[PDB]
């Protein structure tokens, strides 16, 4: 009576299993967090310069193309690379919610919520590469070597993985080039109250997420927080 044995023509499983309504919780939990994290960029009603997609007429639609194949590549992962993601995203999601053992269980049951939390919190307090500009060429080499080491996991063993992909049609890598080139100008041109706000949470972010008591690495990140902002976790790739 099943679709396998010799009795049946290709109609089966018309119902909600406990899989799917588990995963539809994580959809909503990721979205109601991305809402609250984008709601800090648009603080008073005007759209800030952080949350601008494009500058060419068709840069925004192309960024939507690039961002849709982005998270399809996350689904094209091996089972060894499925499992390595959640067990460190849970680690890093504990570091985000310092207290509040409600959230310690909230990020531990749900699996796409914790992946959204560690990227929305670094997008919200602006501790990324492309938001911090080195105040001198001094920090530029510091952040260059962190980018060098952090892109080693994006090309593991000489072979590049798909997680370092940059375009899937011709010309798309060039569109993503020009879009990343405009964002670097926009981050180098913001307000004097925001360049020294992203300066401090970068030091704190590096010190809690990666230093872990190593009194050298803190003493490096305090001098140079663009080197602190330039380090990711492992399962981001690139």
């Amino acid at each position: 009576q099943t679709g396998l044995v010799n009795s049946k023509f290709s109609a089966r499983m018309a119902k909600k299993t406990a899989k799917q309504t588990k995963n539809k919780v994580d959809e909503y939990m990721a979205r109601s967090v991305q809402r609250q994290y984008k709601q800090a960029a648009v603080a008073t009603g005007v759209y800030g310069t952080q949350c601008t997609e494009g500058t060419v007429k068709g840069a925004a639609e192309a960024s939507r193309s690039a961002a849709l194949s982005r998270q399809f590549r996350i689904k094209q992962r091996s089972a060894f690379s499925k499992a390595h993601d959640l067990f460190e995203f849970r680690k890093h999601a504990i570091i985000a919610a310092a207290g509040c053992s409600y959230e310690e269980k909230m990020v531990t049951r749900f699996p796409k919520l914790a992946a959204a939390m560690v990227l929305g919190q670094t997008e919200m307090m602006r501790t990324c590469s492309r938001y911090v500009v080195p105040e001198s060429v001094e920090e530029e080499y510091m952040a260059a070597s962190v980018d060098k080491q952090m892109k080693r996991r994006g090309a593991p063993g000489g072979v590049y993985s798909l997680s370092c992909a940059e375009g899937v049609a011709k010309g798309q890598a060039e569109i993503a080039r020009v879009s990343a080139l405009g964002a670097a100008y926009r981050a180098a041109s913001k307000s004097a109250s925001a360049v020294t706000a992203e300066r401090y949470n970068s030091m704190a972010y590096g010190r809690v997420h990666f230093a872990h008591g190593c009194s050298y690495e803190e003493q490096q990140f305090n001098k140079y927080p663009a080197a602190a902002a330039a380090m990711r976790s492992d399962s981001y790739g690139y």
Partner: protein, 164 residues
Amino acid sequence: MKSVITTVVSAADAAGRFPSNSDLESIQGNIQRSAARLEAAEKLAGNHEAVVKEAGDACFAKYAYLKNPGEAGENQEKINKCYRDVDHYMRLVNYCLVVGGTGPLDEWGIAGAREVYRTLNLPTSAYVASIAYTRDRLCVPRDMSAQAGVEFSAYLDYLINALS
């Protein structure tokens, strides 16, 4: 400073788009209202000695316990700084009638409001009592027009909802 033009220009700038017909449309809405929400700013600008005196003592009439020694509003400069605060709040309402937005209320009276009045023991109910008194002391055909009476009260009740 969320005005009607700051809302559309930053929305067009986040998308990397030129100002299209959506963005041009919002500005004529700041033409039809704004002929009459600025007469409320005339009514507030010339009457502000009397409307902050009449509302300044309304909170002390409701809350007479503040004037006790050892209590919140102990001496005379307490009351002077309280009337200063009511003047400051009505100034931001006068600004909001002029921008067509809640921006000057937000980033100058509402942001960080709760983290001052709690640590300094200033009761927010005494703050909302004056603004609530000013909201119902207004009757429409004597003080302003009909378009002005609704938009002047709407910036008052917004601050009432924001303070508590």
